Design an enzyme around this catalytic site. Structure first.
Site, short mmCIF file in Angstrom:
data_model
loop_
_atom_site.label_atom_id
_atom_site.label_comp_id
_atom_site.label_asym_id
_atom_site.label_seq_id
_atom_site.Cartn_x
_atom_site.Cartn_y
_atom_site.Cartn_z
N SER A 48 0.79 -1.20 0.00
CA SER A 48 0.00 0.00 0.00
C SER A 48 0.84 1.27 0.00
O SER A 48 0.23 2.34 -0.01
CB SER A 48 -0.95 0.00 1.20
OG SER A 48 -2.03 -0.91 1.06
N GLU A 100 -5.29 -3.10 -6.36
CA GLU A 100 -5.46 -3.88 -5.13
C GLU A 100 -6.51 -4.96 -5.37
O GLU A 100 -7.54 -4.69 -6.00
CB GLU A 100 -5.93 -3.02 -3.97
CG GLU A 100 -5.02 -1.93 -3.47
CD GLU A 100 -4.10 -2.41 -2.40
OE1 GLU A 100 -3.49 -1.57 -1.71
OE2 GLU A 100 -4.06 -3.64 -2.20
#
Ligand code: 9F2
Length: 265
Positions: free
Chosen positions: A42, A140
């Site tokens: 992330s 993601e």
């Protein structure tokens, strides 16, 4: 010398640790596996919101984006609470940095537009900063999943530290936009046990964390000494020796960070 502790720390946690603190006027660069490739996880979401800010007038922060439950594919503590209303780009940015919201990151990529749902524009955005090394390839959550040695969705401690350096301390963004990126990182909720936990409390710490499989745990941060001197710290780690299922170890990032503080004091 300091390499002896980082390698010491790697032995303790069965980890590979990459550390980069760019040099300042008074201090020497700190390099530990600095140019080896680690997965973004992330951590890409912080330069990603800078990609959005840079491309768009502030007015664009108010653009409302709708989506379905089918778009929520990873850890998204904010985006799940808004399937019925959607979120504006701004709160997508807020969600993406302060809560590491994955669906929010994916939509911001889509807002970047283009091939691979915006991963090429985002890579393109890093090139505009002088980062010829990094690449994001998937959205993601697949980007957390690449096997070790696969160069997809990787950066290097060196590369990411310098990207963040121009984003927070340099002129990659106009001042009013720079202020928005900095505050989100400053009120981030996900990095309390990582770089922030290794520095004394009277040091200011703004950060964006990353976590993935293979024990991947990253933290990129900008820290201010009590006298107000800024340094950038890239700390990246994985535990591939334990497979796709390796648990991430935050203690490794806090321990390493303290070492950095001891040299920056
Ligand atoms: C710096 O981060 N520290 C945190 C932390 O994780 N807190 C978060 C943070 O900054 N938060 C915020 C917000 O978004 O402002 C909030 C508000 S979130 C919210 N606001 C609304 O206006 C709304 O309509 N709905 N919701 C859900 C409370 S804590 C969470 C923390 C949690 S407990 C503790 N001691 N610290």
């Amino acid at each position: 010398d300091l390499a002896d502790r980082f390698a010491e720390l790697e032995r303790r946690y069965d980890a590979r640790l990459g550390v980069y603190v760019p040099a300042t006027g008074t201090t020497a660069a700190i390099e530990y596996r600095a140019d080896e490739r680690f997965a973004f996880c992330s951590t890409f979401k912080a330069p990603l919101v800078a990609a959005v800010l840079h491309q768009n007038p502030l007015t664009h922060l108010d653009k409302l984006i709708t989506y379905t439950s089918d778009d929520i594919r990873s850890i998204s503590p904010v985006a799940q609470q808004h399937v019925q209303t959607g979120m504006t780009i701004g709160q997508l940015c807020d969600a993406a940095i302060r809560y590491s919201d994955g669906t929010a990151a994916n939509l911001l990529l889509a807002d970047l537009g283009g091939p691979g749902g915006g991963t090429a524009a985002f890579t393109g955005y890093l090139r505009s900063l002088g980062d010829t090394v990094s690449r994001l390839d998937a959205e993601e959550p697949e980007l957390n999943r690449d096997p070790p040695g696969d160069e997809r969705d990787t950066t290097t401690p060196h590369a990411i530290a310098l990207v963040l350096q121009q984003l927070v301390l340099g002129n990659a963004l106009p001042p009013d936009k720079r202020a928005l990126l900095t505050d989100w990182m400053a009120r981030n909720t996900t990095g309390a046990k990582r770089i922030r936990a290794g520095f004394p409390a009277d040091w200011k710490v703004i950060d964006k964390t990353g976590t993935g499989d293979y024990g991947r745990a990253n933290d990129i941060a900008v820290v201010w000494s009590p006298t107000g001197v800024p340094y950038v710290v890239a700390v990246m780690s994985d535990r591939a020796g334990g497979g796709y299922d390796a648990e991430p170890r935050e203690a490794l990032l806090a321990e390493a960070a303290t070492c950095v503080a001891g040299v920056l004091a």
